[PDB]
Design a protein around this nucleic acid. Structure first.
Ligand SMILES: [Ca+2]
Length: 341
DNA sequence: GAAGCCGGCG
DNA sequence: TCCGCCCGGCTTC
């Protein structure tokens, strides 16, 4: 299997520099507020050079970058920019999994006829295209599987091209750190460092139940199949970007006949946002006191709007059976696990 | 079934 | 030593 992972470099900052050519070459900080407190979404090259990084509060960012331009996040525009690129990728892939707004896995096995060198060249073709057509730099990773593809891209940021060849995968799996693995963050790394597991190879020698006691069976077998080079799971035609919609109600209420006019509208604005068929719907009721009450059906296959209305109804008609106490202030829907066709 | 509590992570 | 109309997973009522 040949998989190309495309990751977009500091996407929001790059989109802003594109629409606003006078930002280039000068510090730029994209900001994000909540339901208020400001933090850094992304920062451009010269901002990052000053030490500005994601999560940083806005006052703090200002202290170290007073000359920066701070602009508000504009999700809709970044989402549309992403979509054009996702569609560019689509023309090249047997299968494409949209992981998030700036990440996508491409199965190109058939496109390059199993030729790994032709896989590498296609990934070069793709960077050059994204740059030419959309003026964005991306980092790609070409690898025998999804996880390795992500890991090698991560290792080659920014504007890079990471390669792991099937005829050399064992040397990569020998030198691979335990911390450099998806699913292993800063806490789980420390606890594996409590057995003398720094690298991936180490687990093969360790007793299997102890790893399970530190990670759970799900990640235990996950790390094993990786170290053993038996991780298989393919790329499906599915988008992981969630599409949702919320409407404030004219007043706090618990009457289904009152809130449904607004839920139908919520589903409307969501399904019309989709292109594909969601494998999960989530009804989200925000209460008077601003507490959250959500329930979803994980559909084996997909859900159409024709199926969705009464599926979303008895979701709420259960949310209220679950909460006879409080009134709904705001109603929202969430569609995700979308099947691509 | 689902509250609660951890951990990844952007 | 960062909150999320995170999200997923595992424990525990
Ligand atoms: Ca990222």
């Amino acid at each position: 299997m040949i998989v190309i992972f495309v990751d977009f470099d500091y996407f929001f900052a790059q989109v802003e520099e594109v629409l606003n050519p006078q930002y280039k070459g000068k510090p730029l900080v994209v900001c994000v507020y909540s339901g208020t407190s400001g933090a850094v979404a992304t920062a451009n090259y010269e901002a990052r050079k000053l030490g500005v990084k994601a999560g940083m509060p806005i006052i703090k960012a200002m202290q170290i970058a007073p000359s920066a331009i701070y602009v508000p996040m504009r999700k809709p525009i970044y989402e549309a920019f992403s979509n054009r690129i996702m569609n560019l990728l689509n023309k090249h892939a047997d299968k494409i999994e949209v992981a998030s707004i700036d990440e996508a896995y491409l199965d190109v096995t058939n496109k390059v006829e199993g030729n790994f060198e032709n896989g590498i060249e296609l990934a070069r073709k793709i960077k050059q295209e994204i740059l030419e057509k959309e003026k964005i730099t991306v980092t790609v990773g070409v690898a025998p599987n999804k996880i390795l593809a992500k890991i090698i891209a991560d290792k080659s940021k920014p504007n890079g091209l990471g390669v792991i060849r099937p005829t050399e995968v064992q040397d990569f799996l020998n030198e691979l750190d335990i911390d450099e693995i998806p699913g292993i963050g800063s806490v789980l790394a420390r606890r594996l460092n409590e057995l003398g597991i720094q690298k991936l190879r180490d687990i093969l020698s360790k007793n299997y139940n102890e790893l399970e006691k530190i990670t759970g069976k799900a990640k235990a077998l996950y790390l094993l199949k990786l170290a053993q080079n038996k991780y298989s799971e393919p790329v499906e035609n599915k988008s992981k970007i969630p599409h949702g919609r919320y409407l404030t109600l004219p007043y706090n209420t618990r009457d289904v006949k009152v809130i449904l006019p607004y839920l139908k509208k919520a589903i409307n604005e969501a399904y019309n946002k989709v292109n594909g068929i969601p494998m999960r719907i989530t009804v989200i009721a925000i209460m008077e006191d601003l507490d959250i009450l959500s329930k979803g059906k994980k559909f084996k296959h997909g859900i159409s709007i024709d199926n969705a209305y009464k599926v979303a109804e008895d979701l709420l008609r259960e949310l209220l059976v679950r909460d006879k106490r409080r009134n709904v202030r705001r109603i929202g829907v969430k569609l995700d696990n979308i099947i691509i066709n």
